[PDB]
């Protein structure tokens, strides 16, 4: 295991299992299936693949070129998500929409999406966004807003760095004999505030029950003692002075007008020092509060 570290070795091992994200994915898959039936007048089946928590560069490197990349806003979460519509999926959708029964072999040679193809993309993207919002509303209500569309992964740059860890969710859609894929790409920073909710789903009766749980939590943790350490003074010395140091030595010190009370190094309050009852006491002037 003794190997020289080198840059660009993004050995980012962040392993989790977002059961709530999986359940939202399944609900959105059903909503998208019914929406696709409504639009295409044909019944698809959507298979939700495994969630890939992978670096953004690795996710993008596997994306076929060209492809539909739709930037979306996950309000109020800070940041933007992506919807990936594959060329095969868009081809099949347009073929079904414009009179083609789809029996013809799918010929994807690689080309940009025309304005009519863009309108089709807009339509099923709107349906997907509505279905995803509906799926999420069960856990946390969010507002999804379309931003714009791109053909190249370089156009998007969804993360600050390509090595940023991102969540991808694939869906394989089958209609008759025609297969396609579409993906949902959300940066891990989107879900980091809600990581606790996404890991475990095991709550269904929680609207005021969450408030009751939180109130019980605070009122029960309010009976836990702490370790107040008040650093009276601070002298900088050298190790030679420490080694030669002997009892009876007086160490000069700047006069501490304010004593900082901290716990485990965490500053808690600012106070003045004094003596009462024969013991050292602190009269608090200001608690440490940003």
């Amino acid at each position: 295991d003794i190997r020289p570290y080198d840059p660009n070795t993004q050995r980012r091992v962040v392993r989790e299992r977002l059961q709530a994200l999986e359940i939202i994915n399944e609900r959105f898959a059903r909503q998208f299936r019914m929406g696709l039936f409504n639009l295409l007048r044909r019944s698809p089946d959507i298979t939700v693949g495994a969630i890939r928590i992978q670096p953004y560069h690795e996710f993008a490197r596997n994306l076929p070129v060209p492809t539909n990349l739709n930037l979306i806003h996950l309000k109020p979460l800070r940041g933007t998500g992506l919807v990936v519509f594959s060329p095969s999926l868009v081809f099949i959708a347009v073929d079904n929409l414009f009179g083609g029964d789809g029996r013809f072999p799918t010929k994807v040679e690689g080309r940009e999406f025309t304005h009519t193809e863009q309108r089709v993309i807009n339509r099923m993207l709107k349906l997907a966004l509505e279905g995803y919002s509906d799926a999420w509303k069960a856990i946390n209500p969010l507002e999804v807003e379309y931003v714009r569309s791109e053909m190249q992964v370089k156009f998007t740059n969804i993360t600050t760095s390509p090595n940023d860890i991102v969540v991808n969710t694939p869906f394989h859609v089958e209609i008759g004999n025609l297969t396609g894929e579409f993906n949902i790409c959300l940066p891990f920073s989107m879900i980091e505030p809600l990581r606790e909710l996404l890991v475990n789903p095991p709550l269904e009766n929680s609207r005021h029950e969450d408030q009751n749980w939180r109130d019980n939590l605070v009122r029960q943790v309010q009976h836990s003692e702490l370790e107040l350490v008040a650093n009276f003074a601070d002298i900088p010395l050298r190790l030679s002075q420490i080694l030669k140091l002997k009892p009876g030595d007086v160490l000069p010190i700047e006069k501490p007008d304010r004593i900082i009370a901290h716990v485990d190094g965490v500053p808690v309050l600012t106070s003045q020092y004094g003596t009462v009852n024969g013991q050292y006491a602190l009269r608090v002037e200001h608690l440490i509060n940003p």
Binding site: R15, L217, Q220, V221, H223, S224, E225, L226
Partner: peptide
């Protein structure tokens, strides 16, 4: 227990 103050009860699991 929080700082030695019992506040909760929960089941033991092994993860990773």
């Amino acid at each position: 227990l929080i700082n030695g103050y019992l506040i909760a009860q929960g089941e033991v699991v092994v993860v990773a």
